[PDB]
């Protein structure tokens, strides 16, 4: 299926406590594979996935140099934004950036993007055409004009359609045993009493990969997507994912409700009952 290469960048100022915290985390699909965190005596770009051992020392030296360059530019950004928004030097602020590209199963580009947020709000984003930017407010309109005069979109587009796609393909090749695998979900249902003769049925889906999955509860062949409660799919600590979905049913009727699990590793979806 399709795959993605994404970099999540966060820079946070801490007045009175020194330089801003700077973190850049890279993901292929939903698996963390590289990271840089400024909060270390000797911050270095580090592998977070076993297959990244396949890159030579130059990869790490280059990515580390680039990261240190980012710490500096984001430190400047935090100051600039204080001016744009007329804010004081006493408070902590956050800049976030998500950059990435996605390819189809054939390795061809599907889409690319880069979006910024300041204090958790949209700031500026590259439009889908990868040619122009859209600004969320007047401060971002200043940035838009700077980047247009400097021709930043063309350079970013070159990275998204070129470099980003090429490296994603290489990561998928180098880490194929990990990235292109399919671990089927193993599911079970738990039962919990409630007041008012009602029971909570919780359908668990464990040990699966990739992360995409669908858990539904049915009654009389129909989905109860409405009254269901669920958690966002989440990492389980070893590179696999987990998820649960619950529904509150009448006591004594548990038998009529079925959990359905749909996943890439299930030619036929799983059907369970308490």
């Amino acid at each position: 299926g399709p795959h993605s290469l994404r970099y999540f960048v966060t820079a946070v100022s801490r007045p009175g406590l020194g330089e801003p915290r700077f973190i850049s985390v890279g993901y292929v699909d939903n698996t963390e594979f590289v990271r840089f965190d400024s909060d270390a005596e000797n911050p270095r770009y580090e592998p977070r996935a076993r297959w990244m051992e396949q890159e030579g020392p130059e990869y790490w030296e280059r990515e580390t140099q680039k990261a240190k360059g980012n710490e500096q530019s984001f430190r400047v950004d935090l100051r600039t934004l204080l001016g744009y928004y007329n804010q004081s030097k006493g408070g902590s602020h956050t800049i976030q950036v998500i950059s990435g590209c996605e390819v189809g199963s054939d390795g061809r580009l599907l889409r690319g993007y880069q979006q910024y947020a300041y204090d958790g709000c949209d700031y500026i984003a590259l439009n889908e055409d990868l040619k122009t930017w859209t600004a969320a407010d007047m401060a971002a309109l200043i940035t838009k004009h700077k980047w247009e005069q400097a021709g930043e979109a063309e350079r970013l587009r070159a990275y998204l359609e070129g470099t980003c796609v090429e490296w994603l393909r290489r990561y998928l090749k180098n880490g194929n045993a990990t990235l292109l695998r399919t671990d089927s979900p193993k599911a079970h249902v738990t039962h919990h009493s409630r007041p008012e003769d009602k029971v909570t049925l919780r359908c668990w889906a464990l040990g699966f990969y990739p992360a995409d999955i669908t858990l539904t509860w049915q009654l009389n062949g129909e989905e109860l997507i409405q009254d269901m409660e669920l958690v966002e799919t989440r990492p389980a600590g070893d590179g696999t994912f987990q998820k649960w979905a619950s529904v509150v049913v009448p006591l004594g009727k548990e038998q009529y409700y079925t959990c359905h699990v749909y996943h890439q590793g299930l030619p036929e979806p799983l059907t369970l009952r308490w």
Binding site: Y7, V9, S24, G26, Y59, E63, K66, A67, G69, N70, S73, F74, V76, D77, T80, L81, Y84, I95, V97, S99, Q114, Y116, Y123, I124, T143, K146, W147, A150, E152, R155, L156, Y159, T163, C164, W167
Partner: peptide, 9 residues
């Protein structure tokens, strides 16, 4: 491989 750089705002 990460973006070459992030132009200042």
């Amino acid at each position: 491989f990460a973006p070459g750089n992030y132009p200042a705002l």
